[PDB]
Amino acid sequence: APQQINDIVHRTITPLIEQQKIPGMAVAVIYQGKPYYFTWGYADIAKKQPVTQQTLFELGSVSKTFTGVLGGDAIARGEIKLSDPTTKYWPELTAKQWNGITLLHLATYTAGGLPLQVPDEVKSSSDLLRFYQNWQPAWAPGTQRLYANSSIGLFGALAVKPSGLSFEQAMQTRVFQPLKLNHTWINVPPAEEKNYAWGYREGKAVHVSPGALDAKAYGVKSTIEDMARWVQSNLKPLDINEKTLQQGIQLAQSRYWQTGDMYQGLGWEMLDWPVNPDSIINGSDNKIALAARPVKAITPPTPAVRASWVHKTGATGGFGSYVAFIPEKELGIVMLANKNYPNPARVDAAWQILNALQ
Numbered sequence: 380a381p382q383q384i385n386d387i388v389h390r391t392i393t394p395l396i397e398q399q400k401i402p403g404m405a406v407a408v409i410y411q412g413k414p415y416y417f418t419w420g421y422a423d424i425a426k427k428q429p430v431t432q433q434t435l436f437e438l439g440s441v442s443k444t445f446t447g448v449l450g451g452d453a454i455a456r457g458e459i460k461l462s463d464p465t466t467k468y469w470p471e472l473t474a475k476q477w478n479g480i481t482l483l484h485l486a487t488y489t490a491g492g493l494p495l496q497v498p499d500e501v502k503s504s505s506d507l508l509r510f511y512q513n514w515q516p517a518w519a520p521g522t523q524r525l526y527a528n529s530s531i532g533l534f535g536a537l538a539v540k541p542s543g544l545s546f547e548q549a550m551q552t553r554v555f556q557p558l559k560l561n562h563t564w565i566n567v568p569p570a571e572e573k574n575y576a577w578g579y580r581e582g583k584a585v586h587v588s589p590g591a592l593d594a595k596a597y598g599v600k601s602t603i604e605d606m607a608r609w610v611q612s613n614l615k616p617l618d619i620n621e622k623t624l625q626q627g628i629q630l631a632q633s634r635y636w637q638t639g640d641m642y643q644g645l646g647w648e649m650l651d652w653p654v655n656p657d658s659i660i661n662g663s664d665n666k667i668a669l670a671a672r673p674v675k676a677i678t679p680p681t682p683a684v685r686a687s688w689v690h691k692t693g694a695t696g697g698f699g700s701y702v703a704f705i706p707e708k709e710l711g712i713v714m715l716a717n718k719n720y721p722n723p724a725r726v727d728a729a730w731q732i733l734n735a736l737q
């Protein structure tokens with residue numbers, strides 16, 4: 380890589396790793412649209428397996444960006460509309476509190492206080508129907524944003540219904556494959572197990588716990604090379620050959636709601652560029668990021684703004700991930716770690732790097 384990229388990455392990420400005691404890390408910097416890769420440490424401590432360009436990391440909630448884009452793609456295909464009632468695609472969801480709750484609300488966490496987590500006891504299809512049928516809202520739809528797996532997870536599940544495909548097969552065939560994300564999986568196949576990093580929590584090797592809607596809300600595993608391609612695809616959507624996917628990526632970066640200085644897309648979150656770094660750093664702390672916030676509708680949504688900081692944090696028990704990019708500058712970063720460390724440290728590091736290079 381150019382010396383300036385190597386310099387800021389080494390001065391920023393290498394000490395971050397020491398500070399946070401991260402066992403293994405992969406970073407990609409996209410600069411003038413071209414990817415550069417950086418690796419540290421071990422994918423598997425016990426086996427002394429190094430992190431490589433081939434190492435799969437758990438993306439955690441960075442998966443929500445794939446769900447958002449898949450949903451965007453279904454819209455572009457004319458299969459779903461965000462204005463449609465949730466009940467249009469789940470006719471058995473008949474309970475009165477769902478009247479007025481649309482796919483937009485599910486996708487953007489604005490249904491009125493759907494919970495962060497589906498309770499662990501909720502497993503089967505019948506359990507899931509019961510949970511949503513019994514759920515009572517904290518607020519009217521389209522008034523408050525509460526970041527929630529139960530919200531966007533259900534959006535992902537319903538978005539694929541008209542296609543008839545499973546969520547996994549829609550994602551594979553409509554997003555991963557056209558973008559040549561050849562080492563990106565919702566379910567890691569046996570052939571990839573040797574490349575699947577262990578996560579580390581309290582010094583113990585761990586992989587993500589199964590859950591209802593895991594595939595839709597936090598279930599993607601990917602390599603640093605595939606994630607760099609994901610960034611390139613989101614930096615320059617109108618260069619993707621598949622027309623509905625091009626549009627789907629664009630729709631996921633539309634601004635649907637505003638809270639403070641942030642805007643909610645489909646999976647992606649956005650701020651106007653240039654940003655106050657303290658806003659994104661402090662704003663990424665879970666005490667803010669998981670709190671209810673009042674939203675103003677952007678009526679109608681602003682199409683993807685090139686002058687944006689577009690980003691998403693992700694965590695599982697054993698992994699911490701971050702992706703951020705600025706389409707105007709053809710600039711982006713992916714940080715994948717096999718320890719879950721605080722969000723503000725990730726964002727701070729990403730800001731130092733991208734602000735040096737913009």
Ligand SMILES: OB(O)c1cc2ccccc2s1
Pocket residue numbers: 438439440441495496528596597692693694695
């Ligand atoms: O990485 B995300 O922001 C997630 C938040 C939660 C909360 C509970 C369970 C699983 C997840 S993934």
